[PDB]
Amino acid sequence: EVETFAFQAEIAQLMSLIINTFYSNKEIFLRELISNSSDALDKIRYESLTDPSKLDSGKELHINLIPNKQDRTLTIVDTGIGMTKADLINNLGTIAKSGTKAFMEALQAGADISMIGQFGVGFYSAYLVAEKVTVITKHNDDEQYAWESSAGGSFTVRTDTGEPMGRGTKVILHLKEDQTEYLEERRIKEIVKKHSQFIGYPITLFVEKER
Protein backbone atom coordinates (compact mmCIF):
# COMPACT_ATOMS: atom_id res chain seq x y z
CA GLU A 1 0.00 0.00 0.00
CA VAL A 2 2.48 2.62 1.25
CA GLU A 3 5.89 2.20 -0.41
CA THR A 4 9.00 3.96 0.92
CA PHE A 5 11.91 5.05 -1.29
CA ALA A 6 15.33 6.60 -0.73
CA PHE A 7 16.17 9.86 -2.44
CA GLN A 8 19.27 9.86 -4.54
CA ALA A 9 22.21 11.07 -2.49
CA GLU A 10 22.55 14.46 -4.23
CA ILE A 11 18.86 15.27 -3.71
CA ALA A 12 18.96 14.20 -0.06
CA GLN A 13 21.97 16.49 0.36
CA LEU A 14 20.25 19.47 -1.25
CA MET A 15 17.14 18.90 0.87
CA SER A 16 19.22 18.86 4.05
CA LEU A 17 20.95 22.07 2.95
CA ILE A 18 17.63 23.78 2.19
CA ILE A 19 15.84 22.64 5.33
CA ASN A 20 18.75 23.71 7.59
CA THR A 21 19.98 26.89 5.92
CA PHE A 22 19.85 30.29 7.53
CA TYR A 23 18.35 32.12 4.56
CA SER A 24 15.83 34.85 5.25
CA ASN A 25 14.35 35.36 1.75
CA LYS A 26 12.19 32.24 2.11
CA GLU A 27 9.20 33.73 0.25
CA ILE A 28 10.70 32.58 -3.07
CA PHE A 29 9.27 29.11 -2.39
CA LEU A 30 5.85 30.36 -3.50
CA ARG A 31 7.21 31.80 -6.74
CA GLU A 32 8.88 28.46 -7.45
CA LEU A 33 5.74 26.39 -6.82
CA ILE A 34 3.47 28.76 -8.74
CA SER A 35 5.96 28.59 -11.61
CA ASN A 36 5.97 24.78 -11.50
CA SER A 37 2.16 24.83 -11.63
CA SER A 38 2.30 27.24 -14.57
CA ASP A 39 4.58 24.88 -16.51
CA ALA A 40 2.21 21.99 -15.79
CA LEU A 41 -0.73 24.04 -17.06
CA ASP A 42 1.26 25.03 -20.16
CA LYS A 43 1.88 21.36 -20.95
CA ILE A 44 -1.70 20.10 -20.68
CA ARG A 45 -2.88 23.09 -22.74
CA TYR A 46 -0.33 22.41 -25.49
CA GLU A 47 -1.05 18.67 -25.58
CA SER A 48 -4.81 19.27 -25.80
CA LEU A 49 -4.29 21.09 -29.11
CA THR A 50 -3.49 17.79 -30.82
CA ASP A 51 -5.71 15.65 -28.54
CA PRO A 52 -8.68 17.59 -27.14
CA SER A 53 -9.91 14.60 -25.11
CA LYS A 54 -7.03 15.22 -22.68
CA LEU A 55 -9.29 17.95 -21.25
CA ASP A 56 -12.15 15.55 -20.50
CA SER A 57 -10.64 15.37 -17.00
CA GLY A 58 -11.25 19.13 -16.66
CA LYS A 59 -11.22 22.21 -18.88
CA GLU A 60 -10.50 25.00 -16.37
CA LEU A 61 -6.78 25.83 -16.11
CA HIS A 62 -6.03 27.68 -12.89
CA ILE A 63 -4.04 27.86 -9.67
CA ASN A 64 -5.54 28.11 -6.17
CA LEU A 65 -3.71 29.04 -2.96
CA ILE A 66 -5.37 27.68 0.16
CA PRO A 67 -3.98 28.50 3.61
CA ASN A 68 -5.38 26.61 6.58
CA LYS A 69 -4.51 28.09 9.98
CA GLN A 70 -6.06 25.20 11.91
CA ASP A 71 -3.85 22.58 10.22
CA ARG A 72 -0.99 25.06 9.68
CA THR A 73 -0.84 24.14 5.99
CA LEU A 74 -0.54 26.09 2.76
CA THR A 75 -1.77 24.26 -0.35
CA ILE A 76 -0.94 25.17 -3.96
CA VAL A 77 -3.44 23.47 -6.28
CA ASP A 78 -3.34 23.51 -10.09
CA THR A 79 -5.25 21.76 -12.87
CA GLY A 80 -2.11 21.09 -14.89
CA ILE A 81 -0.94 17.85 -16.48
CA GLY A 82 -0.26 16.04 -13.19
CA MET A 83 2.39 13.40 -12.50
CA THR A 84 2.44 9.64 -12.99
CA LYS A 85 3.71 7.02 -10.57
CA ALA A 86 6.81 6.69 -12.77
CA ASP A 87 7.46 10.43 -12.38
CA LEU A 88 7.02 10.32 -8.60
CA ILE A 89 9.21 7.34 -7.72
CA ASN A 90 11.99 7.60 -10.33
CA ASN A 91 11.88 9.85 -13.40
CA LEU A 92 11.68 13.21 -11.63
CA GLY A 93 14.66 12.27 -9.46
CA THR A 94 16.64 11.03 -12.46
CA ILE A 95 16.39 14.49 -14.00
CA ALA A 96 16.76 16.39 -10.71
CA LYS A 97 20.02 14.57 -9.91
CA SER A 98 22.04 16.69 -12.35
CA GLY A 99 20.24 19.95 -11.54
CA THR A 100 20.72 19.36 -7.83
CA LYS A 101 24.46 18.88 -8.38
CA ALA A 102 24.85 21.98 -10.55
CA PHE A 103 22.89 24.05 -8.03
CA MET A 104 25.09 23.01 -5.11
CA GLU A 105 28.20 23.75 -7.16
CA ALA A 106 26.81 27.23 -7.87
CA LEU A 107 26.07 27.80 -4.18
CA GLN A 108 29.69 26.92 -3.39
CA ALA A 109 30.72 29.39 -6.09
CA GLY A 110 28.69 32.13 -4.39
CA ALA A 111 25.31 31.83 -6.10
CA ASP A 112 22.13 32.71 -4.23
CA ILE A 113 19.53 30.18 -3.05
CA SER A 114 16.85 32.20 -4.86
CA MET A 115 18.39 31.05 -8.16
CA ILE A 116 17.23 27.46 -7.48
CA GLY A 117 14.57 27.66 -10.21
CA GLN A 118 17.22 28.04 -12.92
CA PHE A 119 18.41 24.51 -12.12
CA GLY A 120 14.97 22.90 -12.44
CA VAL A 121 14.81 21.91 -8.77
CA GLY A 122 12.71 24.76 -7.37
CA PHE A 123 10.17 22.36 -5.82
CA TYR A 124 12.64 21.62 -3.03
CA SER A 125 12.60 25.27 -1.94
CA ALA A 126 9.34 24.26 -0.27
CA TYR A 127 11.52 22.95 2.56
CA LEU A 128 12.56 26.52 3.38
CA VAL A 129 9.18 26.94 5.08
CA ALA A 130 7.82 23.38 5.45
CA GLU A 131 8.82 20.54 7.74
CA LYS A 132 6.80 18.10 5.57
CA VAL A 133 5.45 18.26 2.01
CA THR A 134 2.55 16.22 0.64
CA VAL A 135 1.84 16.08 -3.10
CA ILE A 136 -1.51 14.78 -4.36
CA THR A 137 -1.38 14.36 -8.11
CA LYS A 138 -3.51 12.86 -10.88
CA HIS A 139 -2.31 12.43 -14.48
CA ASN A 140 -4.67 11.42 -17.30
CA ASP A 141 -2.61 8.26 -17.87
CA ASP A 142 -2.48 7.02 -14.27
CA GLU A 143 -4.28 6.77 -10.95
CA GLN A 144 -4.35 9.43 -8.24
CA TYR A 145 -1.26 9.25 -6.02
CA ALA A 146 0.03 10.80 -2.80
CA TRP A 147 3.75 11.56 -2.45
CA GLU A 148 5.13 12.68 0.91
CA SER A 149 8.47 13.51 2.48
CA SER A 150 9.77 15.12 5.66
CA ALA A 151 13.32 15.14 4.24
CA GLY A 152 15.61 12.81 6.13
CA GLY A 153 16.55 11.03 2.91
CA SER A 154 13.32 9.15 2.13
CA PHE A 155 9.88 9.70 0.64
CA THR A 156 6.71 7.61 0.38
CA VAL A 157 4.27 7.02 -2.47
CA ARG A 158 0.76 5.58 -2.08
CA THR A 159 -2.44 5.52 -4.09
CA ASP A 160 -4.64 8.35 -2.84
CA THR A 161 -8.09 7.47 -1.49
CA GLY A 162 -9.38 10.96 -0.67
CA GLU A 163 -10.43 13.76 -3.02
CA PRO A 164 -10.44 12.78 -6.13
CA MET A 165 -9.14 15.61 -8.35
CA GLY A 166 -9.84 14.81 -11.99
CA ARG A 167 -6.44 16.11 -13.12
CA GLY A 168 -3.73 18.26 -11.60
CA THR A 169 -1.55 18.61 -8.54
CA LYS A 170 -1.88 19.74 -4.92
CA VAL A 171 1.28 20.63 -3.01
CA ILE A 172 0.49 20.66 0.71
CA LEU A 173 3.10 22.53 2.78
CA HIS A 174 3.12 21.55 6.46
CA LEU A 175 4.77 24.73 7.72
CA LYS A 176 7.47 25.06 10.34
CA GLU A 177 6.10 26.67 13.49
CA ASP A 178 8.08 29.89 12.91
CA GLN A 179 6.87 30.26 9.29
CA THR A 180 3.15 30.90 9.85
CA GLU A 181 3.40 34.33 8.20
CA TYR A 182 2.80 32.51 4.91
CA LEU A 183 -0.72 31.66 6.09
CA GLU A 184 -1.73 35.35 6.18
CA GLU A 185 -3.75 36.80 3.31
CA ARG A 186 -1.74 40.04 3.18
CA ARG A 187 1.61 38.23 3.10
CA ILE A 188 0.56 35.81 0.34
CA LYS A 189 -0.89 38.69 -1.72
CA GLU A 190 2.36 40.65 -1.41
CA ILE A 191 4.42 37.64 -2.51
CA VAL A 192 2.24 36.93 -5.55
CA LYS A 193 2.20 40.59 -6.60
CA LYS A 194 6.01 40.76 -6.42
CA HIS A 195 7.03 37.41 -7.97
CA SER A 196 4.11 35.99 -9.97
CA GLN A 197 2.37 39.05 -11.41
CA PHE A 198 2.77 37.81 -15.01
CA ILE A 199 1.68 34.18 -14.56
CA GLY A 200 -0.65 33.46 -17.47
CA TYR A 201 -3.35 31.66 -15.47
CA PRO A 202 -5.84 32.83 -12.85
CA ILE A 203 -4.33 32.64 -9.36
CA THR A 204 -7.06 32.69 -6.71
CA LEU A 205 -6.05 33.23 -3.07
CA PHE A 206 -8.64 31.61 -0.79
CA VAL A 207 -9.40 33.63 2.34
CA GLU A 208 -10.01 32.06 5.71
CA LYS A 209 -13.41 31.99 7.26
CA GLU A 210 -13.20 32.70 11.02
CA ARG A 211 -12.93 36.23 12.40
Ligand X SMILES: CN(C)c1cc2c(cc1Sc1nc3c(N)nccc3n1CCNCC(C)(C)C)OCO2
Contact positions vs ligand X (CB under 6 A): 36-37, 39-40, 43, 78, 80-83, 88, 92, 96, 121, 123-124, 135, 147, 169
Nearest to 166 by CA among 47, 36, 42, 59: 59
Residue pair 207/185 in contact by the 8 Å Cβ criterion? yes
Cβ nearer to ligand X, comparing 67 with 168: 168
Name the minimum Å distance from CB 210 to ligand X: 29
Residue pair 76/65 in contact by the 8 Å Cβ criterion? yes
Name the minimum Å distance from CB 159 to ligand X: 15
Does 36 carry a binding-site annotation?
yes
Cβ count within 10 A of residue 99: 19
For residues 104 and 108, what is the distance between their CA atoms, to the nearest angstrom? 6
Name the minimum Å distance from CB 32 to ligand X: 9
Cβ nearer to ligand X, comparing 39 with 143: 39
Residue pair 116/15 in contact by the 8 Å Cβ criterion? no
Does 123 carry a binding-site annotation?
yes
Does 78 carry a binding-site annotation?
yes
Does 87 carry a binding-site annotation?
no
